[PDB]
């Protein structure tokens, strides 16, 4: 049975856009803009986009489209780098362990929004402490913050990551709904997902447009917009902003998960993935910018309502999404409709990205093992059920701490290392000239010198710098006033290293399993598997300087 | 899905040769039809793609001309101004039949071309 192809170009484009434009653009990007001075974050973010993220989005799409394999088996062109595919699959699994819990939060809030009196508008609820107060009629004791932290997370019942408690049953039911939706959107291949993304990948844009248009008019929104567009240039001398920008670029665009490779693996050969990558990157960046505009307008609005400064209303984590925006909504007229549309948009943003992240794992491992390829429904069930079981940790009472650890270490330094290894393996060992020849065979034109330079020198160099500084400039993990114990940081670094070490481990395994002399093993490892008949003939390009001097 | 190549033969340098690729089991007029040659490794020669766009390898551009007949389900490669370096076994390949199809990557048996 030959590999099937997307029913339409719109199927592929909507899948790629739904995965790329994700909950990150609304939950992670605006908080990173506030956390890093506002407009100072945008300069590293745009720079990293241009020089690493667009180039590597294009590289992943072209690799998948030409080799027609998943992230793991795509490394038949350079057999030593299959550990990179395994690492990106593992990163995708790690990220889905908590991304679906965020989707479950969105679903819980949506079900809570089916009321004329939103539960986060006032105190007097079973989840409210005796300190609850509405400052617009200290911020942690507001109706919305207390709702999020006690009636949803039940975080008040957890002292820390050492005492996380048992899974919350309402959040467990919402997670069950999310995983069932994912399974039935993924169990029959990419056709069902490509048709499903027609609404999930399009509704968020209308919702976000209305949110932006309304927020820009709210009183005090101008102060938030000014803070958003204010550039603190001394913050660019800190490595934290650059690490955050690079990690956000690769977490939000979707490079380093194996999703783009898996999606392009179902493309027709002549599909223009260059323009697809350009369009998806531009849409992701404009969505991030518009979501940040709306979030900061709401920050200014709430700072005006509270008669406080914008830095006294912003909250770490998913606070800007689940405390600030719900509070502003509750302050509006027709607040029920605003809440319903906001959380439907959040669900639509998260669901297609979870589908893409799970498709990365399913496609990669089914291409790696054909038994899994035949049993698509059973393997999809296995992936979804494993994600559910390991996401149970993030719906516990102290599940926010596990979620913070995961969102810090699953796709932080690890994803940057994975994309760096992708770029190196494709542009140095396989050959940037060979990759350009492949792209010419698909598209008739070779990628411009800008893209080749980014693939071989610029993106690898910036990625290496960001990885090294992220390791060097790591700060102990914290959530609000809670300081994670020293062993939580070691556990998080172990989670990151778990995916990072698959690359050296696979290189060692491939070298040892291969039979022959040292040079024969090296040639087999760096030679494409379909060309392994040349190792005997001793015609390895990588053993000559012209291969390595390809600009 | 089957590809049967023909038209190969011994030709003089600077001559012309028209290879045919009789296709079965799929319509070539929606298909990504590629020509390869193995003198060395199989090197992509030309492609007439799902929407009729013709692309050529730099080694054959301006000399070879790929075309497809919709009535006969045949893909043609008009190789002109042939050189001794064009001597190889030319393979006709169908990457896929476009969108809503399967990635066949089916290859023909090859057709020898010898440029004296
Ligand atoms: C989810 C996370 C990724 C799943 C990793 C599964 C790797 C298992 C595996 O086959 O790895 C072996 C070596 O791996 C290693 O030793 C490193 C991984 C052999 O790898 P292989 O490529 O020979 O596996 C042939 C597949 N049919
Ligand atoms: N930006 C993260 C992206 O939405 C994503 C990647 C991998 C996953 O398993 C996932 O659920 C989501
Ligand atoms: Cl983003
Ligand atoms: Na999404
Ligand atoms: Na994104």
């Amino acid at each position: 049975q030959p590999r099937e192809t997307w029913g339409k170009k719109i199927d592929f484009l909507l899948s790629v856009v739904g995965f790329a434009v994700d909950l990150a653009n609304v939950w992670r990007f605006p908080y990173l803009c506030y956390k890093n001075g506002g407009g100072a974050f945008l300069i590293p973010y745009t720079l990293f986009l241009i020089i690493a993220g667009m180039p590597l989005f294009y590289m992943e799409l072209a690799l998948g489209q030409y080799n027609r394999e998943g992230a793991a088996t795509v490394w038949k062109i350079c057999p030593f780098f299959k550990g990179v595919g395994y690492a990106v699959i593992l990163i995708a699994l790690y990220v889905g362990f908590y991304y679906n819990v965020i989707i479950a939060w969105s679903l819980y809030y949506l079900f809570s929004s089916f009321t004329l009196n939103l539960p986060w508008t006032d105190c007097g609820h079973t989840w409210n402490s005796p300190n609850c107060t509405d400052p617009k009629l200290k911020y942690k004791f507001t109706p919305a913050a207390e709702f999020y932290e006690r009636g949803v997370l039940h975080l008040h019942e957890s002292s820390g990551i050492h005492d996380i408690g048992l899974p919350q049953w309402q959040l467990l039911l919402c997670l069950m709904v999310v995983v069932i939706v994912l399974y039935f959107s993924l169990w029959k291949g990419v056709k069902t997902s490509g048709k499903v993304v027609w609404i999930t990948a399009t509704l968020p844009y209308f919702v976000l447009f209305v949110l932006l248009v309304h927020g820009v008019t709210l009183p005090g929104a101008s102060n938030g917009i000014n803070a958003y567009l204010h550039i603190d240039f001394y913050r660019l001398k800190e490595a934290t902003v650059w690490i955050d920008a690079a990690t956000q670029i690769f977490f939000s665009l979707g490079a380093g998960f194996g999703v783009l490779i898996a999606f392009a693996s179902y493309n027709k050969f002549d599909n223009n993935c260059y323009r697809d990558a350009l369009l998806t990157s531009s849409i992701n960046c404009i969505t991030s910018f518009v979501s940040g505009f709306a979030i900061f307008s709401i920050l200014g609005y709430m700072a005006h309502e509270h008669k406080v400064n914008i830095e006294d209303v912003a909250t770490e984590g998913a606070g800007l999404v689940f405390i600030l925006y719900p509070e502003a909504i509750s302050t509006l007229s027709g607040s029920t409709f605003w809440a319903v549309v906001f959380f439907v948009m959040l669900l639509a943003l998260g669901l297609d990205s979870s589908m893409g992240g799970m498709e990365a794992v399913i496609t990669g491992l089914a291409d790696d093992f054909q038994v899994l390829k035949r049993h698509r429904k059973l393997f999809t069930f296995g992936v979804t059920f494993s994600t559910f079981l390991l996401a149970l940790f993030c719906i516990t009472k102290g599940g926010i701490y596990v979620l913070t650890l995961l969102d810090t270490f699953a796709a932080g330094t690890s994803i940057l290392f994975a994309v760096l290894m992708e770029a190196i393996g494709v542009s140095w060992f396989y050959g940037v000239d060979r990759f350009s020849n492949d792209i010419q065979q698909m598209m008739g034109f070779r990628p411009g010198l800008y893209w080749r330079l980014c693939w071989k020198f610029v993106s690898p160099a910036f990625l290496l710098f960001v990885v090294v500084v992220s390791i060097i400039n790591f700060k102990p993990l914290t959530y609000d006033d809670y300081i994670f114990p020293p062993w939580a940081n070691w556990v998080g670094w172990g989670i990151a290293l778990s995916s990072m070490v698959l690359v050296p481990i696979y290189v060692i395994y491939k070298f040892l399993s291969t039979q022959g002399s040292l040079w024969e093993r090296l040639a087999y490892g760096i030679t494409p598997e379909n060309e392994h008949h040349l190792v005997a003939q001793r015609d390895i390009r990588q053993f000559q300087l012209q291969h390595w001097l390809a600009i | 899905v089957q590809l049967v190549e023909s038209g190969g033969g011994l030709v003089q340098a600077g001559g012309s040769l028209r290879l045919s690729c009789a296709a079965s089991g799929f319509p070539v007029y929606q298909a990504n039809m590629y020509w390869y040659r193995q003198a060395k490794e199989r090197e992509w020669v030309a492609a007439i793609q799902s929407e009729g766009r013709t692309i050529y390898a730099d080694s054959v551009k301006g000399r070879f001309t790929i075309s497809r007949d919709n009535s006969k389900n045949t893909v043609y490669l008009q190789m002109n101004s042939l050189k001794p370096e064009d001597t190889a076994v030319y393979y006709c390949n169908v990457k896929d039949a476009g969108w809503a199809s399967y990635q066949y990557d089916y290859w023909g048996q090859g057709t020898q071309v010898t440029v004296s």
Side-chain angles (χ1 to χ4, degrees), chain A residues 82 86 89-90 93 365 368-369 502 505-506 509:
Chain A
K82 192 171 195 181
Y86 289 140
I89 293 169
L90 187 60
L93 210 73
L365 295 187
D368 198 47
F369 314 87
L502 295 189
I505 286 176
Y506 189 93
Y509 150 77

Side-chain angles (χ1 to χ4, degrees), chain A residues 241-268:
Chain A
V241 71
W242 299 94
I243 301 156
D244 280 357
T247 304
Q248 180 65 11
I249 281 291
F250 284 102
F251 185 94
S252 183
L253 268 176
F257 290 116
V259 178
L260 306 179
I261 309 193
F263 280 167
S265 72
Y266 300 105
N267 282 355
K268 65 178 194 175

Side-chain angles (χ1 to χ4, degrees), chain A residues 24-25 29 45 248-249 252 284 288:
Chain A
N25 301 50
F29 171 87
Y45 177 91
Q248 180 65 11
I249 281 291
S252 183
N284 181 83
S288 292

Side-chain angles (χ1 to χ4, degrees), chain B residues 77-108:
Chain B
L77 187 74
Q78 180 62 65
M79 320 151 33
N80 288 334
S81 266
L82 281 168
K83 318 168 181 176
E85 289 74 41
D86 305 315
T87 295
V89 179
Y90 284 72
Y91 301 93
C92 169
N93 178 230
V94 55
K95 294 287 177 206
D96 44 63
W99 289 128
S101 169
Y102 299 71
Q103 306 179 0
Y104 302 119
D105 203 56
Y106 187 93
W107 298 79

Side-chain angles (χ1 to χ4, degrees), chain A residues 17-19 21-23 99 348-350 352-353:
Chain A
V17 159
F19 179 75
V21 171
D22 71 303
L23 283 170
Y99 198 89
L349 282 165
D352 36 35
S353 295

Side-chain angles (χ1 to χ4, degrees), chain A residues 37-39 220-232 293 296-297 300 310:
Chain A
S222 52
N223 311 302
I225 292 167
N226 293 357
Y228 186 49
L229 303 186
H230 184 66
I231 307 183
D232 300 324
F293 252 110
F296 269 78
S297 67
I310 287 180

Side-chain angles (χ1 to χ4, degrees), chain A residues 161-296:
Chain A
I161 197 161
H162 63 287
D163 155 49
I164 57 168
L166 292 190
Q168 258 286 302
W169 71 263
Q170 303 110 297
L171 284 178
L172 191 137
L173 289 185
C174 292
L175 191 66
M176 263 154 95
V177 171
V178 171
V179 302
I180 289 168
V181 166
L182 291 177
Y183 174 81
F184 285 112
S185 299
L186 283 168
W187 71 320
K188 280 187 169 169
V190 292
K191 180 180 180 180
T192 51
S193 61
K195 187 54 173 117
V196 162
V197 285
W198 279 50
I199 301 113
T200 68
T202 326
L203 172 141
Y205 292 116
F206 304 80
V207 181
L208 190 67
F209 180 73
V210 184
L211 283 184
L212 171 73
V213 168
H214 185 243
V216 295
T217 59
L218 283 170
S222 52
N223 311 302
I225 292 167
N226 293 357
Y228 186 49
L229 303 186
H230 184 66
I231 307 183
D232 300 324
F233 283 111
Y234 66 101
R235 270 169 154 310
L236 299 187
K237 330 302 172 213
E238 334 296 5
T240 315
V241 71
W242 299 94
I243 301 156
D244 280 357
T247 304
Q248 180 65 11
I249 281 291
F250 284 102
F251 185 94
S252 183
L253 268 176
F257 290 116
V259 178
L260 306 179
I261 309 193
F263 280 167
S265 72
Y266 300 105
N267 282 355
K268 65 178 194 175
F269 207 62
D270 67 304
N271 172 64
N272 195 4
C273 40
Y274 170 56
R275 109 193 308 291
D276 300 341
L278 289 182
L279 179 80
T280 314
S281 296
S282 311
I283 294 172
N284 181 83
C285 306
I286 299 155
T287 308
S288 292
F289 200 51
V290 159
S291 93
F293 252 110
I295 288 279
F296 269 78

